[PDB]
Design a protein around this ligand. Structure first.
Ligand SMILES: *[C@@H]1O[C@H](CO)[C@@H](O[C@@H]2O[C@H](CO)[C@@H](O[C@@H]3O[C@H](CO[C@H]4O[C@H](CO)[C@@H](O)[C@H](O[C@H]5O[C@H](CO)[C@@H](O)[C@H](O)[C@@H]5O)[C@@H]4O)[C@@H](O)[C@H](O[C@H]4O[C@H](CO)[C@@H](O)[C@H](O)[C@@H]4O[C@H]4O[C@H](CO)[C@@H](O)[C@H](O)[C@@H]4O)[C@@H]3O)[C@H](O)[C@H]2NC(C)=O)[C@H](O)[C@H]1NC(C)=O
Ligand SMILES: *[C@@H]1O[C@H](CO)[C@@H](O[C@@H]2O[C@H](CO)[C@@H](O[C@@H]3O[C@H](CO)[C@@H](O)[C@H](O)[C@@H]3O)[C@H](O)[C@H]2NC(C)=O)[C@H](O)[C@H]1NC(C)=O
Ligand SMILES: *[C@@H]1O[C@H](CO)[C@@H](O[C@@H]2O[C@H](CO)[C@@H](O[C@@H]3O[C@H](CO)[C@@H](O)[C@H](O)[C@@H]3O)[C@H](O)[C@H]2NC(C)=O)[C@H](O)[C@H]1NC(C)=O
Ligand SMILES: *[C@@H]1O[C@H](CO)[C@@H](O[C@@H]2O[C@H](CO)[C@@H](O[C@@H]3O[C@H](CO)[C@@H](O)[C@H](O)[C@@H]3O)[C@H](O)[C@H]2NC(C)=O)[C@H](O)[C@H]1NC(C)=O
Ligand SMILES: *[C@@H]1O[C@H](CO)[C@@H](O[C@@H]2O[C@H](CO)[C@@H](O[C@@H]3O[C@H](CO)[C@@H](O)[C@H](O)[C@@H]3O)[C@H](O)[C@H]2NC(C)=O)[C@H](O)[C@H]1NC(C)=O
Ligand SMILES: *[C@@H]1O[C@H](CO)[C@@H](O[C@@H]2O[C@H](CO)[C@@H](O[C@@H]3O[C@H](CO)[C@@H](O)[C@H](O)[C@@H]3O)[C@H](O)[C@H]2NC(C)=O)[C@H](O)[C@H]1NC(C)=O
Ligand SMILES: *[C@@H]1O[C@H](CO)[C@@H](O[C@@H]2O[C@H](CO)[C@@H](O[C@@H]3O[C@H](CO)[C@@H](O)[C@H](O)[C@@H]3O)[C@H](O)[C@H]2NC(C)=O)[C@H](O)[C@H]1NC(C)=O
Ligand SMILES: *[C@@H]1O[C@H](CO)[C@@H](O[C@@H]2O[C@H](CO)[C@@H](O)[C@H](O)[C@H]2NC(C)=O)[C@H](O)[C@H]1NC(C)=O
Ligand SMILES: *[C@@H]1O[C@H](CO)[C@@H](O[C@@H]2O[C@H](CO)[C@@H](O)[C@H](O)[C@H]2NC(C)=O)[C@H](O)[C@H]1NC(C)=O
Ligand SMILES: *[C@@H]1O[C@H](CO)[C@@H](O[C@@H]2O[C@H](CO)[C@@H](O)[C@H](O)[C@H]2NC(C)=O)[C@H](O)[C@H]1NC(C)=O
Ligand SMILES: *[C@@H]1O[C@H](CO)[C@@H](O[C@@H]2O[C@H](CO)[C@@H](O)[C@H](O)[C@H]2NC(C)=O)[C@H](O)[C@H]1NC(C)=O
Ligand SMILES: *[C@@H]1O[C@H](CO)[C@@H](O[C@@H]2O[C@H](CO)[C@@H](O)[C@H](O)[C@H]2NC(C)=O)[C@H](O)[C@H]1NC(C)=O
Ligand SMILES: *[C@@H]1O[C@H](CO)[C@@H](O[C@@H]2O[C@H](CO)[C@@H](O)[C@H](O)[C@H]2NC(C)=O)[C@H](O)[C@H]1NC(C)=O
Ligand SMILES: *[C@@H]1O[C@H](CO)[C@@H](O[C@@H]2O[C@H](CO)[C@@H](O)[C@H](O)[C@H]2NC(C)=O)[C@H](O)[C@H]1NC(C)=O
Ligand SMILES: *[C@@H]1O[C@H](CO)[C@@H](O[C@@H]2O[C@H](CO)[C@@H](O)[C@H](O)[C@H]2NC(C)=O)[C@H](O)[C@H]1NC(C)=O
Ligand SMILES: *[C@@H]1O[C@H](CO)[C@@H](O[C@@H]2O[C@H](CO)[C@@H](O)[C@H](O)[C@H]2NC(C)=O)[C@H](O)[C@H]1NC(C)=O
Ligand SMILES: *[C@@H]1O[C@H](CO)[C@@H](O[C@@H]2O[C@H](CO)[C@@H](O)[C@H](O)[C@H]2NC(C)=O)[C@H](O)[C@H]1NC(C)=O
Ligand SMILES: *[C@@H]1O[C@H](CO)[C@@H](O)[C@H](O)[C@H]1NC(C)=O
Ligand SMILES: *[C@@H]1O[C@H](CO)[C@@H](O)[C@H](O)[C@H]1NC(C)=O
Ligand SMILES: *[C@@H]1O[C@H](CO)[C@@H](O)[C@H](O)[C@H]1NC(C)=O
Lengths: 132, 438, 132, 53, 132
């Protein structure tokens, strides 16, 4: 069922995952459509910042070997120190906003391993499987 | 065991400021602006709650400075009135004897430089005594000439407030609470979101708020700090209070070619119903609404206190009286006729005397000034009073309140409190039972 | 054989598909290479609009799980109401311009299922294949 | 007595003695995603289909 | 071991390949964060040129069926005329700068086959494997 932009924002993370694309589209949006003038360089600046805003994180997903995004798995195990809750305590009983409230503390820390571990090791390995 | 799983398109956001841009339909300053959608979208968000804070909402700051920028840009390509700064030879104007009008204008004459830079021309024009001042018939001076230069507003451009919509760029969301209750800040049980804001007219006024939005339920009292009388109070009405203001002067525009090339619009002759401009207010309506306001006040000060209303502390006319624009003309009205009452412990119509100025200073800004051209013919208009800008004045019962203003960011804030801007963060991660194979 | 930019424009859709890359390169092009001045913000605006113009649709191909574009298959069946012709009546006897002339009527309609169906279902499913 | 005709209409500016007015060949280009189409048909009514594009 | 931006620049191509991502991140960088004014359109221009600079080559990697970049293989054989050295003479005894010094001569030439051969043939083929 089509809910609308951010229509699942007020639901559990499990439920919300159903309709990530409805949001995804408008993360970059597009369209929009005497010189200078007020707004003359503001629509300019804003529309630029939108593009940068998008790609800055998209590239990270490019690095984190997935690309086929919205959702993908890794080979990095979850450290229990990063909010030790059960799946039903998390996915079936918590919104994404509530999630960030806690996990945001380890953002860069988790990014470390995502930015690396697998990306490093998945490769070489393959290069070696190509030996024969 | 659980693993790190990567998610994208996550419905989360952080409070953040970015560069907003306008939209409005397809006069004032708006043309270079993206047309609005024929179907503005929205969506109520169920289970979503969070805090608002109108007192730190930087949307106001941007809007304020943007409007200022627009103002200047609309004047640069217009005619400068630099050579008007000359000694004026002025005399009283014999209005219908004896003297009810008090003159208020002088039949000034002066040697003016014309298109023929060389031979000058003795001309005349009617000026308000609020615009000119005696030097040292008698000699007079345009008041602006002691502070800065003055520019004539183009006769083609208008000042009619036009509904403007604000939009955020992709990655940013416009959040809008629909909660009829709001203290000025805190959590809202009922939050929605929109593509863009509703049309807001850039109405400049002091003391009284005009042509704004209406409140639901009861009268709304909002203040950064009610107990702190160094702050002020925003009052939003529930029902439009009609005010009808008139300038009964079918006057002409003896335009004078003080070139070269560029033309000046002087004041011709004043004929017709020589009465002072004034405003008409429905008295019973005012009394009724004021009472509703006092009810609120009772609710934040006690069920055994006394409420008195009075005029300002005086001083700068711009703050002392109610200033507003109608059709290009600038009015200054004595709101003592409104703000003069009291309430205990637990037609009819009102006439408000007004004055007309032609030299004005916007947004408390010094260093420049703008000359309003006289508008030909009788000028009369009507608007909706939709709120008050009040200030809080042996402190155990009787309290006195009075009208203020000055800082016009207050006006924008009186509307934008319904909105806030947040930055979406699409990228998130979470623990999920999944080990990824090659 | 190198034909040139849009060199196959005047051929059947089957034939044209041979050299889609020759076109692809110049869809974004690149290169190009007293203040303000006329052209001062026009080359600016234009070059920006090129970038947006490109990515706006590229993201759609990102959503429509392919990425390795120019051509890819889906798991959405073709509805016969969308111009019922045979393959030889289409691919061996029609240009791309002629194709759009008809199919353009159902553009957003088809996009609906492309934007969704598979993208929704392909996933979850996988998540379930990862159970063991 | 005579008058410069412009003074009854507007101000007038002297063109710099250095700048010229010689017409220079200008080429126009479209940004990526847009194409410049050019018919080579020697015949043309001002509008309609061109056999040779 | 984290070296830093271009930290492996002064090493053999084999060694340098270890930490390509450390460089990759800052190839586009991001962040950064009276009208006009000097710098007013310079930060503008520069930040734009960064985006273009990036994507211009990224698209090529999009065309060259890899996407999962930093490293990927092809089905194009190496022509011996393109600097005939042994692997130990190349990978274990040469920096990337030294490499370009020579191979730069055949840049566009190699791009020809990369831009094409495989991209052309890998496909069609698949279309044919989809017959059943
Ligand atoms: C709170 O909100 C309210 C509601 O919005 C505001 O109230 C409005 O205030 C504005 C002024 O700010 C009023 O605008 C005036 O409208 C006049 C009426 O025009 C209509 O009737 C005439 C007469 O038959 C028709 O000809 C018109 O039709 C045409 O115009 C419309 C719109 O462009 C077109 O769509 C049509 O196709 C027609 O072409 C209207 O139906 C209007 O006459 C008046 O315009 C004169 O005055 C302005 C300056 O104010 C001049 O720029 C302009 O040139 C006009 O002057 C000519 O006509 C007069 C007539 O006597 C002559 O004296 C002049 O010499 C000259 O020839 C103006 O636009 C509006 O009426 C009013 N609305 C309501 C609901 O009452 C409040 O302003 C606002 N409060 C505050 C604080 O601002
Ligand atoms: C908004 O939050 C409310 C809770 O505050 C969520 O309410 C849940 O709504 C659904 C739909 O009405 C209920 O689900 C139905 O429950 C019955 C019985 O359990 C079951 O038979 C149905 O198959 C269905 O699941 C759910 O019980 C109800 N929860 C509670 C606490 O009453 C609603 O889901 C929230 N919306 C968002 C987007 O998260
Ligand atoms: C511009 O208007 C001013 C008045 O606002 C005119 O001023 C007049 O200027 C002349 C020249 O300075 C004065 O004339 C001289 O007066 C003395 C004494 O009366 C006399 O001795 C001289 O022979 C001579 O006439 C004149 O008095 C002065 N008027 C006043 C009111 O001070 C000026 O003439 C005007 N210019 C134009 C073009 O009309
Ligand atoms: C305001 O001052 C102006 C001068 O700055 C006075 O102008 C005078 O206005 C009257 C009425 O338009 C003119 O009178 C008429 O003049 C013609 C020709 O002389 C005569 O045929 C008529 O019988 C009539 O008198 C007068 O000439 C004009 N003066 C000048 C200098 O142009 C106006 O009177 C002043 N108003 C006040 C209340 O004093
Ligand atoms: C709302 O603003 C008002 C004033 O802007 C704040 O009032 C201030 O409240 C404190 C606590 O009652 C007063 O501080 C006390 O003052 C006495 C004498 O100066 C001193 O002896 C104490 O050590 C203490 O500082 C303060 O004077 C009073 N200010 C005024 C203008 O009366 C109130 O705190 C504000 N509320 C919010 C939430 O910030
Ligand atoms: C432009 O349209 C013309 C038709 O108006 C297309 O003509 C086709 O051109 C090819 C090459 O000359 C012909 O193919 C050859 O045909 C012979 C016999 O069928 C076969 O032995 C060869 O192996 C080869 O296929 C084709 O028959 C001819 N079609 C007709 C109607 O004469 C041309 O392909 C069009 N170009 C574009 C880019 O689509
Ligand atoms: C910078 O260039 C220098 C050469 O000018 C490179 O020196 C190499 O440094 C490493 C680390 O000190 C040496 O590796 C060690 O060698 C010993 C014996 O072969 C081996 O037991 C260790 O396991 C280790 O490989 C290496 O021998 C040394 N090379 C020479 C010529 O002395 C250094 O690697 C260069 N850095 C960059 C980033 O390329
Ligand atoms: C999970 O990460 C935490 C840090 O977030 C690691 O914590 C370390 O735990 C050991 C054992 O208690 C201590 O010696 C370290 O001092 C802790 N570090 C800090 C920052 O407090 C823990 O090692 C991590 N687990 C995994 C498997 O890497
Ligand atoms: C113009 O009329 C005003 C009254 O409308 C006169 O005002 C007088 O001005 C002098 C000087 O300021 C004062 O001494 C008087 O008390 C003022 N009268 C009043 C009623 O306030 C002024 O004299 C008049 N000028 C002319 C030339 O007669
Ligand atoms: C600029 O002129 C204004 C009047 O146009 C002068 O303002 C006066 O300022 C003093 C000091 O604040 C007040 O006593 C007067 O009442 C003001 N007059 C009015 C009309 O408000 C100011 O003094 C002038 N400056 C110069 C340098 O002379
Ligand atoms: C906005 O409402 C909040 C409550 O929702 C008010 O918060 C009170 O603030 C004062 C000053 O910090 C504290 O003494 C109270 O204890 C707070 N109440 C609670 C519930 O925490 C705040 O006063 C309100 N603002 C307006 C203008 O009325
Ligand atoms: C004054 O505000 C009232 C709202 O209280 C406005 O009322 C609208 O009036 C018109 C004419 O009767 C109706 O078409 C609308 O439906 C009324 N609105 C509602 C809420 O009832 C009136 O437009 C306002 N006047 C000004 C000038 O804006
Ligand atoms: C002031 O007194 C009035 C009654 O005269 C009180 O009114 C109550 O207000 C609350 C909030 O609106 C309602 O829940 C009650 O039902 C009202 N009572 C009645 C009689 O209507 C109000 O509480 C009083 N304020 C003070 C501070 O005590
Ligand atoms: C304030 O308004 C009151 C009425 O609300 C005015 O009261 C008048 O006061 C004078 C002096 O006591 C009496 O002559 C009138 O009869 C009073 N009117 C009534 C209705 O009682 C008072 O004039 C007002 N003040 C201002 C400055 O206008
Ligand atoms: C193919 O799409 C068409 C619409 O483009 C669908 O048409 C419906 O067909 C049924 C049967 O004739 C009618 O009941 C509907 O009213 C038609 N819809 C409209 C818009 O006319 C058809 O259902 C589609 N087929 C598939 C398998 O989904
Ligand atoms: C501005 O000056 C021009 C001449 O420079 C005037 O033009 C005359 O206009 C009338 C009316 O169109 C014609 O009868 C004349 O033949 C025009 N003269 C020429 C030279 O073409 C115009 O009248 C002047 N305007 C002002 C206000 O005097
Ligand atoms: C490798 O590329 C070279 C060109 O870089 C090719 O060189 C051709 O070699 C043959 C045999 O010596 C000559 O007939 C040609 O004239 C050479 N071309 C030029 C440009 O000199 C060689 O053919 C290529 N090998 C592969 C397998 O394609
Ligand atoms: C994990 O959930 C189980 C029930 O599924 C519960 O017994 C345990 O308490 C939970 N974890 C925490 C930290 O309590
Ligand atoms: C489909 O083509 C066949 C021949 O291959 C033909 O018999 C049939 O008529 C074609 N479809 C249409 C709608 O006619
Ligand atoms: C290739 O390296 C081998 C040793 O591994 C050497 O014998 C031969 O000379 C090398 N190639 C060149 C062109 O010399």
């Amino acid at each position: 069922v089509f809910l609308g932009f951010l229509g699942a924002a007020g639901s559990t993370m499990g439920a919300a995952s159903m309709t990530l694309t409805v949001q995804a589209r408008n993360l970059l949006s597009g369209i929009v459509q005497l010189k200078l003038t007020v707004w003359g360089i503001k629509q300019l600046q804003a529309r630029v910042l939108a593009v940068e805003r998008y790609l800055r994180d998209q590239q990270l997903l490019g690095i984190w070997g997935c690309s086929g995004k919205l959702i993908c798995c890794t080979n990095v195990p979850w450290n229990s120190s990063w909010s030790n809750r059960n799946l039903s305590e998390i996915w079936d009983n918590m919104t994404w906003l509530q999630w960030d409230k806690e996990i945001s503390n380890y953002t860069q820390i988790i990014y470390g391993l995502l930015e690396e571990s697998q990306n490093q090791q998945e490769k070489n390995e393959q290069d070696l499987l190509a030996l024969d | 065991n659980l693993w790190v799983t990567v998610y994208y398109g996550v419905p989360v956001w952080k409070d953040a400021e970015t560069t907003l841009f306008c939209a409005s339909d397809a006069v004032w300053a708006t043309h270079a602006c993206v047309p609005t959608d024929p179907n503005p979208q929205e969506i109520h968000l169920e289970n979503v709650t969070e805090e608002f804070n109108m007192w730190k909402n930087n949307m106001v700051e941007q809007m304020h400075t943007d409007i200022i920028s627009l103002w200047d840009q609309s004047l640069k390509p217009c005619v400068k009135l630099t050579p008007l700064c000359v000694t004026l030879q002025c005399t009283n104007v014999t209005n219908n004897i004896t003297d009810d009008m008090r003159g208020e204008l002088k039949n000034c004459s002066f040697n003016m430089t014309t298109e023929l830079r060389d031979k000058k021309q003795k001309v005349y024009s009617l000026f308000y005594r609020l615009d000119v001042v005696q030097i040292n018939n008698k000699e007079y001076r345009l008041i602006n000439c002691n502070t800065s230069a003055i520019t004539q507003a183009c006769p083609k451009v208008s000042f009619e407030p036009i509904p403007i919509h604000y939009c955020a760029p992709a990655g940013f969301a416009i959040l809008k609470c629909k909660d009829k209750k709001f203290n000025g800040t805190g959590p809202c049980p009922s939050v929605s979101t929109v593509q863009c804001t509703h049309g807001i007219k850039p109405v400049v006024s002091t003391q009284l708020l005009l042509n704004g939005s209406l409140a639901e339920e009861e009268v709304m009292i909002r203040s950064e700090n009610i107990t702190n009388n160094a702050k002020n109070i925003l009052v939003q009405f529930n029902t439009p209070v009609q005010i009808n203001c008139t300038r009964p002067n079918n006057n002409t525009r003896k335009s004078i070619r003080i070139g070269p090339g560029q033309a000046f619009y002087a004041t011709g002759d004043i004929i017709g119903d020589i009465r002072q401009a004034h405003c008409n207010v429905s008295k019973a309506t005012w009394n009724e609404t004021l009472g509703k306001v006092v009810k609120q006040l009772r609710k934040h000060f006690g069920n055994n206190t006394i409420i008195r209303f009075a005029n300002s502390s005086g001083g700068d006319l711009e703050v002392t009286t109610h200033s507003f624009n109608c059709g290009g003309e600038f009015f200054y009205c004595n709101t003592s006729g409104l703000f003069n009452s009291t309430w205990i412990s637990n037609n009819d119509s009102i006439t408000l005397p007004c004055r007309i100025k032609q030299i004005i200073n916007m947004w408390q800004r010094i260093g420049q000034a703008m000359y309003a051209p006289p508008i030909q013919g009788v000028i009369r208009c009507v608007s909706n009073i939709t709120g008050l800008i009040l200030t809080r004045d042996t402190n155990s019962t009787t309290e006195t309140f009075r009208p203020g203003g000055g800082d016009m960011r207050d006006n924008w804030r009186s509307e934008l409190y319904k909105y806030k801007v947040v930055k979406i963060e699409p990228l998130g991660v979470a623990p999920t039972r999944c080990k990824r194979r090659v």
